[PDB]
Amino acid sequence: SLLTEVETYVLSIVPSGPLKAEIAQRLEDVFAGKNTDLEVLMEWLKTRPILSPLTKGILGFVFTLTVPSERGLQRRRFVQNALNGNRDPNNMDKAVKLYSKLKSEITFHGAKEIALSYSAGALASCMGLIYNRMGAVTTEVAFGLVCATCEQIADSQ
Amino acid sequence: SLLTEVETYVLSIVPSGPLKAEIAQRLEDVFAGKNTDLEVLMEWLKTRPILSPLTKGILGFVFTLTVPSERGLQRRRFVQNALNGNRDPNNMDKAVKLYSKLKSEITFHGAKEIALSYSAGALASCMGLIYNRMGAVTTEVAFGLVCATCEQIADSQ
């Protein structure tokens, strides 16, 4: 299941312990269409301890895509910094290169496979590019990108 | 003064009429620091008739850059959508290339010079990288980048 897969890849990069079962629960409620309202979750996430800025950025990216509507909720600075690729032009170049390819994909698996050739930083930057409205993709591709990003991050630990 | 320079360049891409006189006054007010709030200014811009999304975006970039502080105001969706080079991979590729060079640039004239070598689309995309926190440049250089963008847009007109 698309969302089942997303949850597994996302949690893989989340520290073990209490907070993790919290993210699992919130992720599942949002996926089930339950716990509505994007800015409440985002603010909760922004202020959570233990989580690294990147994993918050990755989660922030997920909630933003999965909630029915974000309304006029502006994109969060905290997420924007986390997915900034460290302002490294090299990551950016790769990000755009990767974006150019994902642009024609519409399936989760097709998107996941092409993005796995890139570094975790290149992928986070691509995510950033999409989160910042400068790049656009389908929900399934965005999710593939997230999973590849998580896989890459996880396999480096 | 670099600022009055930015004003003229920015004003060059605004159509004539009473609205242009107001933009001029608000810019001059910001420069003199007539204690103007960013949220207030951005909402004003956002809702102006006549001005196109691009002009609105360019002006929004100048205001956030010259206000004393954003006061924690999240970046605006209307600007992000205006400065995304139309989400085109090529303008984006060129933008990253220009950013890569502006990064090491330190003067207004130098940034402007190199900037004028790129297309208007790659310049708006570049302004987007800055506005989205994906890249970072010294103010004077950013000032160079906007004037270049305006010069290229004014020329094609």
Numbering used by the authors:
A (entry chain B), B (entry chain A): 2 to 158
Quote the paper:
The full-length M1 protein includes 252 amino acids consisting of a highly organized N-terminal domain and a flexible but less ordered C-terminal domain that are linked by a protease-sensitive loop.
M(NLS-88R)-acidic has monomers A and B or C and D associated to form two independent physiological dimers (dimers 1 and 2, respectively) in the crystal. Interactions between the monomers that form the face-to-face dimer in M(NLS-88R)-acidic, M(NLS-88E)-acidic or M(NLS-88E)-neutral involve hydrophobic contacts (mainly between the symmetry-related helices H6, and between helices H9 and loops L9), as well as several hydrogen-bond and/or salt-bridge interactions. In addition to these conserved inter-subunit hydrogen-bonds, the G88R mutation also results in an extra hydrogen-bond from Arg88-NE to Arg134-O in M(NLS-88)-acidic structure. This additional inter-subunit interaction may explain why it took longer for M(NLS-88R) M1 to disintegrate in vitro at pH 5.5 than wt-M1, as the fulcrum of M(NLS-88R)-acidic was relatively difficult to break during the dimer interface rotation. Of note, the face-to-face dimeric interaction is stronger than the face-to-back monomeric interaction as indicated by the BLI data. Thus, the acid-facilitated M1 conformational change is likely irreversible, presumably to prevent dissociated M1 from re-associating with vRNP in the cytosol after virus uncoating.
